[PDB]
RNA sequence: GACGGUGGCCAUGGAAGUCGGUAUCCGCUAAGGAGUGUGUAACAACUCACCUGCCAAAUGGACUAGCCCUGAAAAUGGAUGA
RNA sequence: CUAUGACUCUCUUAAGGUAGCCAAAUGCCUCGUCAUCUAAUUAGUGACGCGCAUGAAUGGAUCAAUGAGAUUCCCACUGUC
RNA sequence: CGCUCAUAGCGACGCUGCUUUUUGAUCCUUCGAUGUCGGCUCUUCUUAUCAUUGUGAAGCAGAAUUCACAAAGUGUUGGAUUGUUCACCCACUAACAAGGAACGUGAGCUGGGUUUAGACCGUCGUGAGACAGGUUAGUUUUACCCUACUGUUGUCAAUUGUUUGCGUAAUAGUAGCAUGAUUUAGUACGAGAGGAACUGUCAUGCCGGAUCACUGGUCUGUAGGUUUAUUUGACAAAAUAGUGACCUGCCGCUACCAUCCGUUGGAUAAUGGCUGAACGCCUCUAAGUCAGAAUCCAUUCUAGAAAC
């Protein structure tokens, strides 16, 4: 029903879908993708294959509304 | 030897055993619900077309069942259901070895379905041009008499009847210059009524809404996804040598044994795993979809409450490749037989089930229109995706 | 007076059921009879919610507070919250606690004027909790354990704790709380006392597994 | 064992933690490990392991731990799974982490439970819920 | 209808036909074991042997021995040859 | 009574198993008895030894290194799940 | 014996059978060569029925157990050790019943035993050597023929109309089974100890039929991202390394590594009754009839005939 956010990402988790991750830190993570969970595991804030919008956000190439987010 | 295990439960079922390439390209069943209904309101069958699957969050309807009002997701098979154009009435008469074709009657206004089964046919060809030689109804006044004669006779003489209907697949996304013909046996009331009203309906065009109500279970039919010939492994769900040191095969070991001193039917073997019939039952039906006159889209959202937007059930990008719903459709409960772009068929329940979690009301909440590395959700991925590109992007991929 | 109630034929009446000075919560269990009974007991007194907390049968061990505020973790949906709010009076604050680091109820025993916290809950979180109720929060365990509200049946009129509690801590717990702590158990020596009996000042609920003496003892404790 | 608790087999499922696999104690018993001999309930078939759940009550043994517990048969309850599963909600939960918690056949679990417990397990098992450090 | 001596003597101090041991007789009658069980504290109460009222011509039994049945269960689908 | 047999009688054939070793690549019975290792072990190892039928260049016992040799367990290994 | 009481449950001495799942006896068959033992795989069948369906006995109050009929419809497990069926333990389960099919199943596997050569011991042998003793290492060939099966065309190599469509439905197969928690109910029952069922609901185990909306899996999308080495003067952008590696990866297939779907009527067996004789009473039986199985046969589903 209701949307939420990924908590490793600026892009929302659409309604239903996705996968959680409860690490043993007593702190839940949600996840959109396998790509991003892998990224999380790696421990590099999504800036390493340049499709992903987080990279776009920070360096600000050809983005006005993604960069301000 | 005893066996000695116990289990070996017959890997498979012998109730689908001939497991060959099915007769009809369409969904087809040689069985119907019986007589205890009104009349033309109860047409029994219908024919749809598959167009993929989505998921829908709704609430449960069961007390003591992780809350009767708590949300759960479920999949759904959405299926473009164009309205059909009945055209022949056909009278079966009951006899010493079942029922037989006494004699049909056909409508005078239309005879293009006949034609449609013709261009794709013949090889010498004497009668393609436009004519016939398996006997069909022409003529205004002289054929009228014949029709009249037929109608009375069938009405008087024994046993129940069906209507030659067919789909309108030209107006569907997939192009086909032949359409799919079907019987929808008519139940209830009395034979006089039944025979009569078919004639009236020839010109008229039935709707899926005409057959089913939004909380009614289905007797669903189709023809299974045509994988093609493959061996005994995933044709029957057998086992293998998981640590692997064998010069034979993936294929199984004994096929009967020196037992009746020959090999039996009852042994899983190398054949094919696709176009088969079958029938799955008791499908809830969650939402009958409305027709779309190329203007509005609230009609294919459903509610505006809990839906809380205006969208078609079709995805953000939509269907450029696959069966695109522009018509009446059907949200069932998840999974139907047959691939994503197939000619299904529907019947109402043979035994119309009156149970709880079957007869009770269903009310949807969220119907989703998502996608991944490709598009997204409706207006949200439509905002951020378009600033980057000038022509390559138009949330279409077209 | 005290009544000996079951739930799913069990002794535990602080997992499915919650009961404080006011506001009773029960999760929609398969058995309706047991739901009805509570309602009957608390007729034109305390409204039962009949709402599965966090969409689940667990209630007493996933919620804290009494009748100034009422606590709920982040696991609960907005919808869930709303229903709860509707069920109870709209004088009390029912509010979701951000940044989940524990299952509340097992770590938040409380009274009308202070509260006993985990401790090990984060500072910000603690502050939020304090705000929601209005009452104070005091960082102290129960000897051996770290879960308080499970091993301390905390109300104004009396407080039950298992015998494993030490002498000094108990002495200073009592001082802190301004109500004495009494050594004792329920359900023939069950370690989890608070799940065994849920305590309201006017009527005290308990499992069926207690003996005749134990029940009497508990009655005497809570001034009934 | 009990058997009268609390409630059902608890709706949809996904097993995965099979026989053989060692999982964490997540408890103040002197054991660190719980090796699973077998799982209660799983009737099975030809060469299928009686696979454990996230609640499904389990026969165990402390492979490594306190040598007053070491060796013997043990029992417990499985508490988190290394592999994911879909829920009643239509949502997936995931730990790389995996663990049980030592218990008697009675239903009683000894003391406290360290780190996040499954919601399903809690629902099933009241004792677990009672001394739950965190429930997801 | 199925009694009197009679609650037979014993054990009991209740076992009074009938938890139960041993003797197991006589009266009177159409007939009635010092009693066939049910029941009861044991009795009482009921029933059985035993007799008679009515109805009204066959009845009862212990065996033999024809056919049949039971006994008589096992592995591809099956055998008076059909 | 010894565990065993130094011993004394006696017979066979000259003697009658010392050091050691052991259910051993040598133990029928035998899945020996005990301890251990395993949730569970006709397996492994360490003990016991009238040993069906061990034993001193027919070489006895030991053993570092060595080993495409033989076996057990643990750890890295999870499509040899 | 079972207190008492032969047959609730057992059953002496004793007696009659059946079986071919033990092993012998035999030597008909085969030495122009049926590949011997086990395990895996997979079906089939038998019932001498362990579970479940329905029934009846009990020393059956409840609980659990025991005994028996109908019935083989559906189940009949995970492991240590053993070459091993056999054996013996641990653990689950409603239960983990016995069997058969050339001691089912080697051009299906494996070769752990047994089966040659080499070789170690121990006992035996003057010795060459022996061992239903122990130990160790030891090439498992062939289907491109007929049949049988599986699916796939095609045909009455015209039955004496073409041509197709929409149909029928004989024949055959046939599928779902089993549990738990709760409701009943802490009720019935029981002095207490304890402690049910019909019925309702939510689930679960295995079985089957589909599907891919989610999640995961996979990647010649040689789709992007990264980087090793070499080559192309450099950047650039490419090539090779038989897809260079690595990350990510739609579409597509696919996972109890996910999702959905698995019906109702008659006919009975056992058995429990009715009315009611033979046998003035009696008796479920004889005439007759009622109720009644996970059973049978239909409905369902598959296929669709030298059948319409």
* 3-class state of residue B122 by DSSP: coil
Q: Do D91 and A28 touch (CB under 8 A)?
A: no
For residue D90, the chain A residues in CB contact (below 8 A) are: 16
Mutation pick from B67, B71, B73 vs chain C, by most beta carbons of C within 10 Å, is B67
For residues B178 and B103, membership in a common domain is answered with yes
CB atoms within 10 A of CB D12: 14
- What method was applied to determine this entry? cryo-EM
Contact B276, B22 (CB under 8 A): yes
Residue B346 has φ and ψ, to the nearest 5°, of: -125, 150
- For residue B73, the cross-strand partners are B57
For residue A64, the chain B residues in CB contact (below 8 A) are: 387
Which of B78, D91, D12, C76 has the alpha carbon at shortest distance from A17? D91
The burial class, CB within 10 Å (0-12 / 13-18 / 19+), for D73 is exposed
Extents of the domains making up chain C = 1-224
Q: Do B66 and C79 touch (CB under 8 A)?
A: no
Name every residue whose Cβ is closer than 8 Å to that of residue A52 and which is 6 or more positions away in sequence. A35, A36, A39, A46
How far C102 CA lies from chain A's nearest CA (Å)? 7
* CA-angle at D79, arms to D13 and C101, nearest 5°: 115
Q: Dihedral of the CA atoms C180, C181, C187, C189 (nearest 10)?
A: -140
Please state, in angstroms and rounded to a whole number, the distance separating the CA atoms of residues B335 and B364.
Answer: 17
Which of D46, D44, D73, D43 has the alpha carbon at shortest distance from D60? D73
Which of C92, C91, C103 has the alpha carbon at shortest distance from C70? C92
- Phi and psi based region of residue B164 (left: phi greater than 0; alpha: psi -120 to 50; beta: remaining): beta
Contact C186, C210 (CB under 8 A): yes
Q: Do D93 and A20 touch (CB under 8 A)?
A: yes
Q: Which helix (H) or strand (E) holds B134?
A: none
String of DSSP letters for B86-100:
--EEEEEEEEBTEEE
- The two tokens of residue D48 are 């299928």
Question: What total of structural domains would you count in chain B?
Answer: 3
**Strand F nucleotides with an atom less than 7 Å from a protein beta carbon:** 37-40, 75, 78-81
Contact B300, B289 (CB under 8 A): yes
CB atoms within 10 A of CB B242: 6
Q: Which helix (H) or strand (E) holds B149?
A: helix B142-156
Could you write out the three-class secondary structure of chain C?
A: CEEECCECCECCCCCCEECCCCCEEECCCCCCHHHHHHHHHCCCCCCECCCCECCECCCCCCCEECCCEEEECCCCCHHHHHHHHHHCCCCCEEEECCCCCCCCCCCCEECCCCEEECCCCCHHHHHHHHHHHCCCCEECCECCECCCCCCCEECCCCEEECCCCCHHHHHHHHHHHCCCEEECCECCCECCHHHHEEECCCCEEECCCCCHHHHHHHHHHCCC
Residue B90 has φ and ψ, to the nearest 5°, of: -130, 130
**Strand E nucleotides with an atom less than 7 Å from a protein beta carbon:** 76-77
CA distances for B201 relative to B109, B164, B196, B225, angstroms: 12, 11, 9, 35
String of DSSP letters for B188-231:
SS-HHHHHHHHHHHTTS-B-HHHH--TT--EEEE-------EE-
Please state, in angstroms and rounded to a whole number, the distance separating the CA atoms of residues C217 and A53.
Answer: 65
- Spell out which residues of B between 161 and 200 contact strand G, using CB within 7 Å: 164, 180-183
* 3-class state of residue B382 by DSSP: helix
CA distances for B255 relative to B232, B236, B259, B267, B357, angstroms: 12, 14, 10, 6, 44
Residue recorded with tokens 């218990």: D103
Please state, in angstroms and rounded to a whole number, the distance separating the CA atoms of residues B27 and B344.
Answer: 5
Please state, in angstroms and rounded to a whole number, the distance separating the CA atoms of residues B76 and C148.
Answer: 46
For residues B268 and B278, membership in a common domain is answered with no
- The two tokens of residue D37 are 């001999």
For residues B29 and B6, membership in a common domain is answered with yes
Please state, in angstroms and rounded to a whole number, the distance separating the CA atoms of residues C16 and C9.
Answer: 12
Q: Which helix (H) or strand (E) holds D78?
A: strand D74-80
For residues B343 and B300, membership in a common domain is answered with yes
The CATH number linked to B172 is: 3.30.1430.10
Please state, in angstroms and rounded to a whole number, the distance separating the CA atoms of residues C29 and B67.
Answer: 8
* CA-angle at B111, arms to B110 and B113, nearest 5°: 110
Which of C79, C82, C68, C128 has the alpha carbon at shortest distance from C101? C128
Distance C168 CA to E39 C1' (A): 75
The CATH number linked to B280 is: 2.40.30.10
Which fold, A1-69? Ribosomal Protein L24e; Chain: T; (2.30.170)
Q: Do B64 and C55 touch (CB under 8 A)?
A: no
Q: Do C12 and D123 touch (CB under 8 A)?
A: no
* Greatest pairwise CA separation for chain A in angstroms: 39
For residues B106 and B202, membership in a common domain is answered with yes
Please state, in angstroms and rounded to a whole number, the distance separating the CA atoms of residues B360 and B252.
Answer: 47
- Spell out which residues of D between 78 and 107 contact strand F, using CB within 7 Å: none
Which of C76, C18, C75, C10 has the alpha carbon at shortest distance from C50? C18
Please state, in angstroms and rounded to a whole number, the distance separating the CA atoms of residues C91 and C65.
Answer: 14
- The two tokens of residue B380 are 């949200």
Name every residue whose Cβ is closer than 8 Å to that of residue C74 and which is 6 or more positions away in sequence. C96, C97, C98, C99, C100
Which of B343, B355, B210 has the alpha carbon at shortest distance from B281? B355
- The two tokens of residue C159 are 């407080």
The burial class, CB within 10 Å (0-12 / 13-18 / 19+), for C73 is buried
- The two tokens of residue B261 are 């001193």
- The two tokens of residue D21 are 């696999």
- What's the domain range around B234? 1-43+225-273
For residue D123, the chain C residues in CB contact (below 8 A) are: 56-58
Q: Are strands C115-117 and C138-139 parallel, antiparallel or unpaired?
A: parallel
For residues B211 and B231, membership in a common domain is answered with no
For residue B74, the chain D residues in CB contact (below 8 A) are: 90
* CA-angle at C146, arms to C141 and C149, nearest 5°: 80
Please state, in angstroms and rounded to a whole number, the distance separating the CA atoms of residues D97 and D81.
Answer: 6
* 3-class state of residue D62 by DSSP: coil
Distance D45 CA to G68 C1' (A): 32
CA distances for A15 relative to B306, C119, C224, angstroms: 12, 36, 51
Distance C23 CA to G188 C1' (A): 38
Residue B146 has φ and ψ, to the nearest 5°, of: -60, -45
Residue B10 has φ and ψ, to the nearest 5°, of: 60, 90
Last residue of a domain, one of B179, B206, B233: B206
Please state, in angstroms and rounded to a whole number, the distance separating the CA atoms of residues B175 and C146.
Answer: 70
Domain C1-224 in CATH 3.40.1180.10? The answer is no
Does the nearest atom of strand E lie within 7 Å of B265's Cβ? no
Residue B113 has φ and ψ, to the nearest 5°, of: -60, -40
Residue B154 has φ and ψ, to the nearest 5°, of: -60, -45
Residue B144 has φ and ψ, to the nearest 5°, of: -55, -45
Q: Do D129 and C61 touch (CB under 8 A)?
A: yes
For residues B213 and B335, membership in a common domain is answered with yes
- The two tokens of residue D115 are 């780190």
Dihedral sign computed on CA atoms, order C8, C10, C12, C13: positive
Of D90, D91, D136, nearest to A22 by CB-CB distance is D136
Q: Which domains does chain D have, with CATH numbers?
A: 1-136 (2.40.150.20)
Cα atoms in the 13 Å half-sphere on the side-chain side of C74: 14
Which of B281, B285, B284 has the alpha carbon at shortest distance from B351? B281
Please state, in angstroms and rounded to a whole number, the distance separating the CA atoms of residues C103 and B362.
Answer: 34
State the Rg of chain D over Cα.
14
Name every residue whose Cβ is closer than 8 Å to that of residue C36 and which is 6 or more positions away in sequence. none
For residues B158 and B16, membership in a common domain is answered with no
Does the nearest atom of strand E lie within 7 Å of B261's Cβ? yes
């Amino acid at each position: 029903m209701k949307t939420s956010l990924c908590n490793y990402s600026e892009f929302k988790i659409y309604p239903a879908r996705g996968m959680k991750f409860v690490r043993g830190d007593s702190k839940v993570f949600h996840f959109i993708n396998t790509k991003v969970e892998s990224l999380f595991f790696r421990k590099i804030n999504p800036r390493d294959i340049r499709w992903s919008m987080v990279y776009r956000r920070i360096y600000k190439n050809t983005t006005t509304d993604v960069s301000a987010k | 030897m005893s066996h000695r295990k116990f289990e070996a439960p017959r890997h498979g079922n012998l109730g689908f055993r001939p497991r060959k390439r099915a007769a009809r390209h369409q969904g087809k069943v040689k069985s119907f619900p019986k007589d205890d209904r009104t009349q033309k309101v109860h047409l029994t069958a219908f024919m749809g077309y598959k167009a993929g699957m989505t998921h829908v969050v709704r609430d449960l309807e069961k007390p003591g069942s992780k809350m009767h009002k708590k949300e759960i997701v479920e999949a759904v098979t959405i299926i473009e259901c164009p309205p059909m154009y009945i055209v022949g009435l056909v009278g079966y008469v009951e006899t010493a070895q079942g029922l037989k074709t006494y004699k049909t009657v056909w409508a005078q206004h239309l005879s293009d379905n006949f034609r449609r089964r013709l261009y794709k046919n013949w090889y010498k060809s004497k009668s393609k041009k436009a004519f016939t030689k398996y006997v069909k109804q022409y003529e205004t006044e002289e054929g009228k008499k014949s029709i009249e004669a037929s109608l009375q006779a069938i009405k008087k003489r024994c046993s129940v009847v069906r209507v030659i209907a067919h789909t309108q697949v030209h107006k569907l996304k997939l192009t086909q210059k032949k359409a799919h013909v079907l019987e929808i046996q008519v139940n209830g009331g009395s034979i006089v009524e039944k025979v009569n009203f078919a004639v009236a309906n020839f010109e008229k065009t039935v709707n899926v809404t005409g057959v089913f109500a939004e909380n009614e279970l289905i007797d669903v039919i189709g023809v299974t996804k045509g994988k093609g010939f493959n061996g005994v492994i995933k044709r029957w769900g057998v086992r293998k040598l998981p640590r692997k040191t064998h010069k034979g095969l993936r294929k199984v070991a004994c096929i009967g044994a020196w037992h009746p001193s020959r090999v039996s039917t009852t042994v899983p073997r190398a054949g094919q795993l696709g176009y088969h019939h079958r029938v799955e039952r008791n499908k809830k039906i969650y939402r009958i979809g409305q027709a779309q006159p190329e203007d509005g889209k609230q009609i294919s959202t459903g509610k505006t409450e809990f839906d809380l937007t205006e969208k078609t059930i079709n995805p953000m990008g939509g269907f450029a490749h696959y069966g695109m719903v522009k018509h009446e459709f059907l949200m069932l409960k998840g999974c139907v037989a047959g691939p994503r772009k197939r000619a299904l068929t529907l019947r109402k329940s043979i035994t119309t089930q009156t149970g709880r979690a079957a007869l009770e009301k269903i009310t949807l909440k969220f119907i989703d229109t998502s996608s991944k590395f490709g598009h997204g959700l409706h207006q949200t991925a439509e905002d951020k995706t378009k600033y980057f590109g000038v022509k390559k992007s138009r949330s279409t991929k077209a | 007076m005290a009544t000996r109630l079951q739930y799913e034929n069990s002794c535990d009446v602080g997992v499915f059921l919650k009961l404080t000075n006011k506001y009773c919560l029960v999760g929609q269990c398969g058995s309706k009879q047991f739901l009805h009974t509570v309602e009957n007991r608390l007729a034109d007194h305390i409204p039962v919610v009949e709402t599965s907390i966090a969409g689940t049968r667990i209630v007493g061990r996933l919620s804290a507070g009494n009748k100034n505020g009422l606590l709920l973790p982040n696991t609960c949906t907005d919808q869930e919250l709303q229903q709860i709010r509707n069920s109870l009076p709209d004088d009390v604050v029912v509010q979701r606690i951000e940044e989940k680091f524990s299952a509340l109820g097992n770590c938040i025993a409380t009274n009308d004027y202070v509260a006993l916290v985990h401790p090990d809950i984060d500072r910000e979180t603690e502050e939020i909790i304090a705000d929601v109720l209005g009452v104070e929060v005091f960082r102290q365990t129960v000897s051996g354990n770290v879960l308080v509200g499970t091993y301390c049946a905390l109300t104004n009129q009396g407080a039950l704790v298992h015998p494993m509690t030490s002498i000094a801590d108990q002495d200073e717990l009592s001082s802190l709380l301004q109500v004495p702590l009494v050594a004792g158990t329920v359900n023939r020596g069950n370690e989890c006392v608070a799940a065994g009996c849920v305590v309201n000042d006017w009527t005290a609920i308990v499992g069926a597994d207690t003996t005749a003496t134990e029940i009497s003892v508990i009655e005497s404790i809570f001034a009934l | 064992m009990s058997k009268a608790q609390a409630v059902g087999s608890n709706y949809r499922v996904s097993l995965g933690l099979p026989v053989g696999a060692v999982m964490n104690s997540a408890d103040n018993s002197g054991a660190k490990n719980l090796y699973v001999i077998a799982v209660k309930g799983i009737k099975g078939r030809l060469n299928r392991l009686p696979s454990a759940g996230v609640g499904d009550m389990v026969m165990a043994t402390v492979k490594k731990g306190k040598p007053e517990l070491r060796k013997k048969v043990c029992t417990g309850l499985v508490v988190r799974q290394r592999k994911h599963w879909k829920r009643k909600d239509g949502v997936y939960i995931y730990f790389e982490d995996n663990a049980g918690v030592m218990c008697n056949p009675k239903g009683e679990v000894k003391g406290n439970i360290l780190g996040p417990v499954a919601k399903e397990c809690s629902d099933l098992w009241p004792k677990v819920a009672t001394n739950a450090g965190t429930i997801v």
